């Protein structure tokens with residue numbers, strides 16, 4: 134599956150490049166370079182979800198070459214939405230590596246020009262949708278869906294950054310209630326809801342109950358995925374995950390610190406206060422010792438088992454009339470992941 | 473005109489704020505703050521152009537309250553597109569002030585979080601269009617128009633930044649041919665074409681000849697406007713323009729350097745080579761002395777007279793069947809501007 138999906142990328146590149154106006158040639162070469170560094174190297178769960186789900190929702194005799202091509206292309210549109218966000222995210226989080234190579238903005242010669250690079254990747258979504266789905270009854274649905282997903286994710290990031298000021302203590306806002314909102318908005322909508330929802334619209338499924346039902350399962354699945362992400366920031370292998378963690382030094386409202394705070398003694402509270410949110414490596418080292426000392430890896434492994442069971446109960450409840458396989462495929466893909 | 477337009481801004485703010493989900497309250501407060509700092513303080517030529525042109529194209533008996541409200545709102549959508557771009561632009565150009573206050577990203581407490589702030593402003597466009605024009609026959613036209621304008625402007629910025637590497641000499645690419653492309657894409661489409669084109673679509677004017685004709689006049693008018701902008705970077709009053717210039721130190725392909733290069737002796741060429749594109753204040757001072765020594769202020773004042781006459785000749789040719797007043801209003805607004 135992955136190999137077929139991933140191999141469509143050069144057609145994606147070729148169409149967006151074929152826009153040679155030989156005056157903008159140099160900016161089009163620059164965009165090619167940006168697509169290849171930034172869109173390649175991840176898992177492709179989002180883009181493959183668009184494709185798998187489409188096949189599962191459309192009768193095979195209606196899966197002609199042109200409509201499967203549209204499915205691949207909308208999958209790559211979710212991959213570009215992702216790239217757009219990660220490139221910007223890496224800048225704002227002072228990150229070092231992404232997908233096992235240095236973050237694009239750290240490339241000598243690139244710098245904060247990557248800000249325009251990220252906006253350019255976002256624009257490619259709508260060019261792709263124009264070029265392949267313009268004459269489709271779902272065209273506007275997809276456009277409004279991508280735009281709403283972008284907005285939601287920018288709201289969430291806004292709350293991610295607010296709650297994590299450089300230079301200021303902020304343990305008072307690290308609550309479960311707060312964590313849930315941030316992750317709903319910054320991750321769950323675009324990573325889980327958007328890809329399945331894209332495929333539904335392409336299969337002709339636009340009912341509000343049907344979309345709201347898919348949303349019940351998929352938002353929960355997004356919360357879970359971000360929680361895993363927060364655990365891997367501190368406790369994952371950067372050669373495996375492809376990325377160096379920064380949450381503690383960026384003062385972030387990570388699942389870990391939330392859980393630390395509800396378990397911590399007043400003296401433990403103080404350790405976190407003196408040590409969290411700062412670049413000093415020995416202060417980070419202390420926070421991690423507090424985490425390991427409170428058995429948060431075990432706390433997480435139990436949360437991961439329970440959350441998973443609740444997700445499977447939501448599928449039993451809300452999957453119909455869609456095949457459970459649609460959601461089971463994704464769930465089983467992200468469960469117990471170390472990457 | 474301006475006062476009525478500018479006074480609609482709190483309804484704009486109130487609708488985008490009314491999205492209180494009291495969980496995202498803090499990100500919505502943050503967005504309000506971002507609208508006020510970044511959308512206010514300029515000339516409003518773009519947003520007022522949407523409004524003036526709409527009134528001039530729609531029979532008065534059809535200018536009801538709801539449709540004028542839609543016109544104001546689409547005008548503010550062009551103002552937000554502008555804000556989005558300037559905030560990002562100021563970061564990538566290492567600028568200090570904007571509209572007579574420090575650039576948003578230089579505000580203590582803000583920093584590169586302004587990258588998400590800019591994306592959030594862009595998203596507001598599409599929320600506004602959804603909220604006010606969803607049930608209008610021009611809705612998709614406006615959406616595709618805003619998205620295409622964004623893409624064009626990102627292509628141009630891409631070429632602006634490429635041609636202006638930090639650390640590297642690049643006088644060999646500072647050609648008229650190159651300058652024209654960069655400014656077509658980075659300025660002319662969104663600042664001139666987009667606002668009039670928005671108003672046409674809202675008046676029911678979607679013919680391709682009619683849009684292409686408006687484009688002939690308006691792109692030329694955009695080139696002219698960027699040329700003025702480049703002159704004011706070096707030769708304008710920062711208390712008037714509201715912004716400190718950075719072109720020479722950012723190594724930019726400004727109208728001035730292009731014109732310098734076609735007039736320069738080989739020894740003058742060398743002065744520019746040793747001095748252009750660097751932060752050192754005495755090197756910038758030398759470049760400006762080379763400019764004044766070649767009479768480029770006078771070269772510009774003559775270009776400004778000639779270009780203007782050619783623009784007025786294009787209006788005579790291509791304005792019909794639209795009123796010439798539509799384009800004359802804009803032209804006369806930007807001509808001989810010191811701000």
Ligand SMILES: O=P(O)(O)C(O)(Cn1ccnc1)P(=O)(O)O
Pocket residue numbers: 218219222223226293319320362366
């Ligand atoms: O931890 P984050 O929220 O920043 C992250 O997961 C990215 N992201 C961005 C939006 N939602 C998630 P990453 O760890 O890749 O840096």
Ligand SMILES: O=P(O)(O)C(O)(Cn1ccnc1)P(=O)(O)O
Pocket residue numbers: 557558561562565632658659701705
């Ligand atoms: O000179 P620039 O192109 O950067 C500028 O005009 C902004 N801009 C951005 C896109 N087109 C123009 P500003 O002088 O405001 O910094």
Ligand SMILES: C=C(C)CCOP(=O)(O)OP(=O)(O)O
Pocket residue numbers: 174175176177178215232320324358359362472
């Ligand atoms: C939302 C989060 C946690 C950001 C990373 O998403 P992935 O972990 O799916 O990253 P890639 O496969 O796209 O590299």
Ligand SMILES: C=C(C)CCOP(=O)(O)OP(=O)(O)O
Pocket residue numbers: 513514515516517554571659663697698701811
């Ligand atoms: C395209 C350019 C030259 C950037 C600034 O546009 P304006 O000079 O119209 O700035 P504001 O009135 O929006 O402040």
Ligand SMILES: [Mg+2]
Pocket residue numbers: 222226293
């Ligand atoms: Mg982040």
Ligand SMILES: [Mg+2]
Pocket residue numbers: 222223226228
């Ligand atoms: Mg991050």
Ligand SMILES: [Mg+2]
Pocket residue numbers: 362363366
């Ligand atoms: Mg993370």
Ligand SMILES: [Mg+2]
Pocket residue numbers: 561565632
């Ligand atoms: Mg610039």
Ligand SMILES: [Mg+2]
Pocket residue numbers: 561562565567
């Ligand atoms: Mg600039």
Ligand SMILES: [Mg+2]
Pocket residue numbers: 701702705
């Ligand atoms: Mg300028």
